Design a protein around this ligand. Structure first.
Ligand SMILES: OC[C@H]1O[C@H](O[C@H]2[C@@H](O)[C@H](O)[C@@H](CO)O[C@@H]2O)[C@@H](O)[C@@H](O)[C@@H]1O
Ligand SMILES: [Ca+2]
Ligand SMILES: [Mn+2]
Length: 237
């Protein structure tokens, strides 16, 4: 099966599987049951921003989610991505809906990864920045219901012609090129990701959430991962 490290923006509390009783953000290491969570005052209809950072010196995965003129939500977890992820990976965005829904719109997404070898200076880097998605975005691997181009945005889950979010939907978008996240003899490696999202729903309890994830290169949507599984895990283990 796939190896998944993700930062989830969980809008629906599935208490039957360990979620806290409120929308939250969490750090998921190979499991949908976050190793660490933080309360998130999600705002229906507003545009938010997520920022995720990591470096091999501190070995700490941190994320901050904010809305303009509102306090931010922060979550951190000490983890050595070398002990978890394969050397080469792919990075992406995933979302789902199930019984209750929401739009899982991404307006912008940027990512930067650096890897420095022992050889004096000479750092390797990868950076991509999408501020406008188009139809036929060949540098993205769209999976499930994910689509691009509508209003220049990336809709991870199904949205009807009039803009109504559909339930029982799942979609992901991964950057085409694999990323060298670590090397056995690297002095320092780091990455930073940023994305702005718009989650709105006519439900009083939107669902299910969006996630930024890092996986094996060949990852694909596991069967029946709609809803609470955020399109990342095959089960709730
Ligand atoms: O989209 C939210 C949520 O909807 C569905 O789960 C609800 C219900 O159908 C289940 O019977 C109960 C208990 O298991 O949980 C919910 O109330 C599922 O699609 C779920 O995956 C999803 O998160
Ligand atoms: Ca949930
Ligand atoms: Mn959760």
């Amino acid at each position: 099966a796939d190896t998944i490290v993700a930062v989830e923006l969980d809008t629906y509390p599935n208490t039957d599987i360990g979620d806290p009783s409120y929308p939250h953000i969490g750090i998921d290491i190979k499991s949908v049951r976050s190793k660490k969570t933080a309360k998130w005052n999600m705002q229906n209809g507003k545009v938010g921003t997520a920022h995720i950072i990591y470096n091999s010196v501190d070995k700490r995965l941190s994320a901050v989610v904010s809305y303009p003129n509102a306090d931010s939500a922060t979550v951190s977890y000490d983890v050595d991505l070398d002990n978890v992820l394969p050397e080469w990976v792919r990075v992406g965005l995933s979302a789902s809906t199930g019984l209750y829904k929401e739009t899982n719109t991404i307006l912008s997404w940027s990512f930067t990864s650096k890897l420095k070898s022992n050889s004096t200076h000479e750092t390797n880097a990868l950076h991509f920045m999408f501020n406008q998605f188009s139809k036929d975005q060949k540098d993205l691997i769209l999976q499930g219901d994910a689509t691009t181009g509508t209003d220049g945005n990336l809709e991870l889950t199904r949205v009807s012609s009039n803009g109504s979010p559909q339930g029982s939907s799942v979609g992901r978008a991964l950057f085409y090129a694999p990323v060298h996240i670590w090397e056995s003899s690297a002095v320092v490696a780091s990455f930073e990701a940023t994305f702005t999202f718009l989650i709105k729903s006519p439900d009083s309890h939107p669902a299910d959430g969006i996630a930024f994830f890092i996986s094996n290169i060949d990852s694909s949507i596991p069967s029946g991962s709609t809803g609470r599984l955020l399109g990342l895990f095959p089960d709730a283990n």
